[PDB]
Design a protein around this ligand. Structure first.
Ligand SMILES: O=c1cc(-c2ccc(O)c(O)c2)oc2cc(O)cc(O)c12
Ligand SMILES: [Mg+2]
Ligand SMILES: [Mn+2]
Length: 179
């Protein structure tokens, strides 16, 4: 309710519109599952920030793209690099390291979400990078891909979001709602 308002105020309209569409495609109503709505918005925002954290066009964004375009990007990349085709769409491709990236944002402990992602992925080559809202991070082989300053920007954004939700008394419900 107030969470819906929070989302519409806190996130850029491009992000919010994407999230609304994404949820509706799974039969979920943004105006009802408002915690899910915020979580989806945050994860997308983190994918965009992450993609801007290195050199100009170091990263292809895959999250947020319609399915056809996403798989176009992915098949194309596996075709031009010989890198293995994932079973599920990842979040980005790193041109410098030549590997796909799965981004996780979690309210819980990072190690728990890291393991869930890892054992869902199956693809031996896709890098995993997990962020929490309380400034923790965890990445495959402890390789964090970006420099400390770019990661600090994400971590601080996430902290500010959590503080803002707390300010409005939404943080408790948000945190507990993660399944
Ligand atoms: O767009 C959605 C995106 C995702 C999602 C969740 C975690 C990830 O690490 C990720 O890369 C994507 O999960 C959802 C879960 C939903 O219930 C509805 C949605 O629209 C989404
Ligand atoms: Mg994704
Ligand atoms: Mn992800």
């Amino acid at each position: 309710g107030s969470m819906e308002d929070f989302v519409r105020q806190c996130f850029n309209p491009m992000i919010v519109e994407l999230a609304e569409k994404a949820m509706k495609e799974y039969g979920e109503d943004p105006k009802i599952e408002t915690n899910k709505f915020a979580a989806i918005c945050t994860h997308l925002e983190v994918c965009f920030m992450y993609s801007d954290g290195g050199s100009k066009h170091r990263f292809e964004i895959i999250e947020g793209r319609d399915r056809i375009m996403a798989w176009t990007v992915v098949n194309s990349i596996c075709n031009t690099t010989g890198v293995e085709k994932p079973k599920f769409l990842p979040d980005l491709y790193d041109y410098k390291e030549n590997r796909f990236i799965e981004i996780g944002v979690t309210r819980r402990e990072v190690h728990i979400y890291y393991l869930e992602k890892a054992n869902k992925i199956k693809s031996e080559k896709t890098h995993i990078h997990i962020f929490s809202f309380t400034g923790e991070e965890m990445a495959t082989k402890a390789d964090y891909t970006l420099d400390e300053e770019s990661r600090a920007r994400i971590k601080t954004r996430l902290f500010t979001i959590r503080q803002e939700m707390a300010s409005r008394s939404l943080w408790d419900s948000f945190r507990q709602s993660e399944r």
